[PDB]
Nucleic acid binder design. Structure first.
Ligand SMILES: [Mg+2]
Ligand SMILES: [Mg+2]
Ligand SMILES: [Mg+2]
Ligand SMILES: [Mg+2]
Ligand SMILES: [Mg+2]
Ligand SMILES: [Mg+2]
Ligand SMILES: [Mg+2]
Ligand SMILES: [Mg+2]
Ligand SMILES: [Zn+2]
Ligand SMILES: [Zn+2]
Lengths: 83, 24, 91, 98, 102, 70, 150, 160
RNA sequence: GUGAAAUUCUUGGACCGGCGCAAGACGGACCAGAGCGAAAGCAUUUGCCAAGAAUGUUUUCAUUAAUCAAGAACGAAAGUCGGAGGUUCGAAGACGAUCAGAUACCGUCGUAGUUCCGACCAUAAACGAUGCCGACCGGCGAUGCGGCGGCGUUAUUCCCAUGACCCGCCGGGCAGCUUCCGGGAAACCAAAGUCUUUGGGUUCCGGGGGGAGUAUGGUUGCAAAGCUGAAACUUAAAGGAAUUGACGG
């Protein structure tokens, strides 16, 4: 394809491309609200967190660090931050 | 000759030359 | 300045006894007259008294060791083997 | 992990907490009752180790047997001399839990 | 001229491959270079299967197989005709010869 | 076979062996004929098994690294 | 490519185009500064401080939220480490390798890695002495470096 | 055995003879050459474990177990290779579930349960959560030491 | 044992079969145009010790970088020195064959060596006969690692996780197929392309064939030898890739 529009790529290929190789760099990670059952406060957690995030009001772990993304403990709820 | 055997022959000749010169 | 190119401690033997014999005795004499770190007090004051006897100046500890080195690799492997056989013998 | 963790915690006791290095000062601090942790190299003489353990039992203070020697404990303290016995007056870094 | 792109062996991202001995002449050949044949032969001849079946003390006795992996230097392979020389274009294929089932 | 029959043995298990070791693993030309002759002589046949000595790994095979030049 | 390895990896961090602080971040500049102060007193290096702050407290960039970098904040308060973090970790690695090597004399791979690590140490020390972070007479000695780390 | 497999062989050394009857006892077992060679195949990983374990009555046995990774029915990939940590976990699992089937029981009920190779079957069942295996057997067992040869024990092994 | 033999071992039980013992090597099959390592190289289990690429990162520093005379580390095999060990194989050597001869190819035996520890040597067709860093320039299917997303099958369990498959995407690798991208003397090469439309940075290095990697000097080494390295003289070709023919035990 000699006439690919490099200026305006559609979001499908814009997302399939590597983070650095996009037209403008965009991280693949995000921030999430996490709810621990039996607790009221809301924890802001990085999606690719490298540390065990703990609640200050309960001796419970929220996420476990993995290779790519922090695995949330079962029973915990989460939502995105502003897409 | 094979190049390896020319190399061996030259090494023998060089040892003989060194021995002759050292004798002097 | 550097006083000898290669003889080092066997420069006291002059031209005698042969270069290979002097080279052979060089490392043995260096290890013989070296001061080793004492494993009891931690000081570098463990030196040979007689053949096989190594005394520390500070803690006055005397150890049975090698002829020219504080310990021999043979004895080290022996100690490790005896420890392994003891821990295998008991449970 | 334990050895590197205790080395790092000792490094942070240095430069941030009050300590004292050596047998005589360690005994003096223990009998003043303000030594909260006493670290002993495994190189320590057996009599000295036993006596410091008895002093610590009397003073109700903890004793940690460092897995090094006096040279390595000096290095862990960051000094260029051998230390065989040391005491911590106050950690300042959660080496000693409140 | 370079006869083969792979230099007649399978070594691609390696420095050294351990040698093996040719089953015919005991020559040291790199393992990735030697011609390997995995022969799975009936332990008895197809002429003698009936005699062994008749002389068997069992009725439904399955005759054992014989599993031998043979390694050849290319000299013995060519002399024994397991491999043959091919044209310049025909050297490039790697498909094994058909089993000729029917 | 005739010696076995006159000593009163009727059936035989079979253990086929090649040279083994670091040397060849293929049985020689005589195995097939020997077993077929035993079968056709009236001797009964039982289990058959190969017992060729297979090294988990062996000493160096004779012949040098250039092999047997012929 | 890597300085001392034949690797050409691309794993990096893609900082977003939006430099603005997110609206859901309730932490103020002084609050983040106090958190950094507490973590530095606990003994964390600036990389670990940033990791903890991003993972737990939801702050994306300390520079974006406060206007200053973590090392700048620590140096302004007066509790930045005497050695730079990366130089300290390189010296720590070199000390560990030397400690392994003095028992494993046949570990020629370890000797090669030690040469690589010490070359990196010397290049980084040259850079820091050029930038006057380090004293002009600062030198890495293999014998006395063990008392500086851990 | 009346209807068991044929690729399993037992050694059955003779300890005592009385009258015209030699009396045997277990000495070891082995798989056959053809069965082992047929099990070994390409594009798959085999895990081998060995363990020295003492029975309750003083028989010391060296057990050798083998297993081979199994390809799925819908698998398209040619090879079925287990990673090194998976192989190590499988080996550790199949060592620790050969120990406990020998340590807590006598040689008689060790032999009668390796007759159907139930040890290999439970090894294969246990290892499915790491990597599937199909050809799992106790490949070999050899007697290392024997306890003093009690004739009463020999006679109760033979008769009742 | 061989093409055939013979040297050799054998009624003293050789070979063969069985049960044991001892020693030192070697880690088959799994084992792949698969992995790791700067190369050399690396394959039985388990533990310990440090190390590492790739990946993930909205972490940190902020140009700290690339290539590099001199210098330094490692560097197959053979070889050298000291100590252990020496099963097999096996330079030298001995013998039997073969032959016109046969100091060989084949066979029997066998020293050094091959093994381990420590110290040298620094050479290989040490090869991809192909410097490193960076950018761009086709398609396709795979494979290894890591990550991400999805119908489903499977393992237990009560569901998700987590493994084993299936379908894709991304990044870094070993490669492969294909192509009038282009290049090249061509073989061929997605690099050996982006070169008379000649300039991204940088290191080494060749100047017809021989003499010759020789002489000499210097330097390194216990030695063997390694590095540096001419000239006289001689020669009209020597070479590379392809084509046709002829020939092939
Ligand atoms: Mg040719
Ligand atoms: Mg090579
Ligand atoms: Mg021929
Ligand atoms: Mg070598
Ligand atoms: Mg020697
Ligand atoms: Mg021989
Ligand atoms: Mg350049
Ligand atoms: Mg010229
Ligand atoms: Zn002392
Ligand atoms: Zn061959």
């Amino acid at each position: 394809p000699l006439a690919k529009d490099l200026l305006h790529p559609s979001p499908e290929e814009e997302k399939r491309k590597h983070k650095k190789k996009r037209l403008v760099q965009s991280p693949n990670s995000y921030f999430m609200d996490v709810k621990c059952p039996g607790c009221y406060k809301i924890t802001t957690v990085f999606s690719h967190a490298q540390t065990v995030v703990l609640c200050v009001g309960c001796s419970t772990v929220l996420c476990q660090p993995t290779g790519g993304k922090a695995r949330l403990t079962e029973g915990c709820s989460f939502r995105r931050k502003q897409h | 000759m094979r190049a390896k055997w020319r190399k061996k022959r030259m090494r023998r000749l060089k040892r003989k030359r060194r021995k002759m010169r050292q004798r002097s | 300045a550097k006083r000898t190119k290669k003889v080092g401690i066997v420069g006291k033997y002059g031209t005698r006894y042969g270069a290979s014999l002097r080279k052979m005795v060089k490392k043995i004499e260096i290890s013989q007259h070296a001061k080793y770190t004492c494993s009891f007090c931690g000081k570098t004051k463990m030196k040979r008294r007689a053949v096989g006897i190594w005394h520390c100046g500070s803690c006055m500890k005397t150890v049975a060791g090698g002829a020219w080195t504080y310990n021999t690799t043979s004895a080290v492997t022996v100690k490790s083997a005896i420890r392994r056989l003891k821990e295998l013998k008991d449970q | 992990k334990s050895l590197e963790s205790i080395n790092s915690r000792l490094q942070l006791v240095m430069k941030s907490g009050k300590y004292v290095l050596g047998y005589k000062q360690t005994l003096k601090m223990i009998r003043q009752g303000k030594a909260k942790l006493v670290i002993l190299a495994n190189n320590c003489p057996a009599l000295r180790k036993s006596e410091i353990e008895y002093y610590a039992m009397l003073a109700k203070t903890g004793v940690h047997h460092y897995s090094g020697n006096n040279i390595e404990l000096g290095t862990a303290c960051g000094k260029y001399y051998r230390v065989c016995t040391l005491a911590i007056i106050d950690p300042g870094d959660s080496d000693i839990i409140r | 001229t370079k006869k083969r792109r792979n230099n007649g062996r399978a070594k691609k991202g390696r420095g050294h491959v351990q040698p093996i001995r040719c089953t015919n002449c005991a020559r040291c050949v790199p393992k990735d270079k030697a011609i390997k044949k995995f022969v799975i032969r009936n332990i008895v001849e197809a002429a003698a299967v009936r005699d062994i079946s008749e002389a068997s003390v069992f009725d439904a006795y399955v005759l054992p197989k014989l599993y031998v992996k043979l390694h050849y230097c290319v000299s013995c392979a060519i002399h024994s005709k397991v491999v043959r020389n091919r044209s310049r274009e025909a050297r490039k294929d790697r498909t094994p010869p058909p089993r000729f089932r029917p | 076979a005739q010696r076995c029959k006159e000593l009163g043995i009727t059936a035989l298990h079979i253990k086929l062996r090649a040279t083994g070791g670091n040397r060849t693993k293929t049985p020689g030309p005589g195995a097939q004929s020997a077993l077929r002759a035993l079968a056709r002589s009236g001797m009964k046949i039982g289990r058959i098994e190969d017992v060729t000595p297979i090294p988990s790994d062996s000493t160096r095979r004779k012949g040098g690294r250039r092999g047997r030049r012929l | 490519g890597r300085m001392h390895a034949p690797g050409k990896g691309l794993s990096q961090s893609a900082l977003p185009y939006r430099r603005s602080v997110p609206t859901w971040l309730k932490l103020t500049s002084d609050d983040v500064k106090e958190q950094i102060y507490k973590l530095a007193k606990k003994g964390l290096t600036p990389s670990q401080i940033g990791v903890i702050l991003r993972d737990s407290h939801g702050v994306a960039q300390v520079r974006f939220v406060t206007g200053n970098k973590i090392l700048r904040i620590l140096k302004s308060k007066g509790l930045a480490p005497d050695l730079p973090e990366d130089l300290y970790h390189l010296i720590k690695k070199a000390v560990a390798v030397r400690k392994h090597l003095e028992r494993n004399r046949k570990d020629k791979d370890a000797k090669f890695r030690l040469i690589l690590i010490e070359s990196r140490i010397h290049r980084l020390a040259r850079y820091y002495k050029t930038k006057r972070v380090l004293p002009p007479n600062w030198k890495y000695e293999s014998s006395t470096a063990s008392a500086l780390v851990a | 055995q009346n209807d068991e497999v044929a690729f399993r062989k037992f050694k059955l050394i003779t300890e005592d003879v009385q009258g015209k009857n030699c009396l045997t006892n277990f000495h070891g077992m082995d798989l056959t050459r053809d069965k082992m060679c047929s099990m070994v195949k390409k594009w798959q990983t085999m895990i081998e474990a060995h363990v020295d374990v003492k029975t309750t009555d003083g028989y010391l046995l060296r057990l050798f177990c083998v297993g081979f990774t199994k390809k799925r029915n819908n698998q398209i990939r040619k090879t079925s290779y287990a990673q090194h940590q998976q192989v190590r976990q499988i080996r550790k699992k199949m060592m620790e579930i050969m120990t406990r089937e020998v340590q807590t029981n006598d040689l008689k009920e060790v032999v009668n349960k390796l007759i159907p190779d139930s040890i290999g079957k439970d090894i294969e069942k246990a290892c499915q959560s790491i990597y599937p295996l199909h050809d799992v057997f106790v490949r070999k067992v050899k007697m290392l030491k024997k306890p003093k040869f009690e004739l009463g024990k020999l006679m109760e092994l033979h008769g009742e």
